[PDB]
Design a protein around this ligand. Sequence first.
Ligand code: MN
Ligand code: MN
Lengths: 199, 199
Amino acid sequence: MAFELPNLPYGFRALEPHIDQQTMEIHHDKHHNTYVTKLNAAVEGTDLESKSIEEIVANLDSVPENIQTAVRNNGGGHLNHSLFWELLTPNSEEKGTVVDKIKEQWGSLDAFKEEFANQAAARFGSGWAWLVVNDGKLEIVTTPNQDNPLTEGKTPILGLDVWEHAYYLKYQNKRPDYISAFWNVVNWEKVDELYNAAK
Amino acid sequence: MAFELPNLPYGFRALEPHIDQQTMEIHHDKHHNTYVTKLNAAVEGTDLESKSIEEIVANLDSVPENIQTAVRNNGGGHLNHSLFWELLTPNSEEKGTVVDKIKEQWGSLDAFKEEFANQAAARFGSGWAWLVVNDGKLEIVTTPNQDNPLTEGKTPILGLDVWEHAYYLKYQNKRPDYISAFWNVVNWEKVDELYNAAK
Ligand SMILES: [Mn+2]
Ligand SMILES: [Mn+2]
């Protein structure tokens, strides 16, 4: 069926001890796969079936009424996880075009991490924390559920899943320890690629 | 500080093998306790501090603007978990005034379980599934995050936490297996008590 579940760029253990193998397997093979399944079921036989997931999520207001929510939720899930897997790496190095821009705007990388971590922690319920480019400038935003900033005309360049499935097996309630661990596995080359592509 | 974390009516292992000890401990000692902490911080020095949690949640529109969300979220968390612990038991028996009413209205207890389970499963993101009394009649509804039907003038008589923290350690993504397990630990005497109190 139309959309497909992308492979991880790395093995399921790749991100230990920051994110456990069991979570990487369930999160990818089960959670992300379910979004794909339900997205395909929603769009089957529609003009949407053949669009890129980015163009669908960017333009949710153009979706037929009877599948607006299914597409928002499962289309968003598909997009958000596809970005997430590419944004993680076992060989992270905190350097590059966006890291240099973060240091210029926030003053240091720690000051950016603090704001991101605290916005991430403050997202009540399920959702995501993002670094976005909005009209050429960097901003930190959060979204509920599987909503994505593309829908509001902001390009995501880094995202962190703060649904409890993303962290509960290893960290339980300690979302801030998960958030802290995430910095060790950020693919800043991917961030810089997404930043360069931004419209 | 004003509101207090209620004790469980039973021990932390009480609900095994349907809900694991580790989840009961974290869920109560950490998640629920945090709602109490943050609720107290929001209401400290306000006229709200001395109200019952029910009257606060029932009347969220009367909360001062600058703490509306903190009270909705943490007040709701406090109420919802306080109800939840009382609604579980190691000695459940599917009988009573509400079970007889469920069989009359749905036709069987399985038909009610099906609807409840599927509404519970369909609640996207974090939230709760409820059996409520609305103007004397039973209805199944779900709410996001820590919202509670009392706010909309419906009295909850059974609730199931479908935040992933409630089920992830034992069931991971298999929310429906958690939902199915929950039936074994429902305190229908408490349900009948809440039903009898309803205004
Ligand atoms: Mn996720
Ligand atoms: Mn909970």
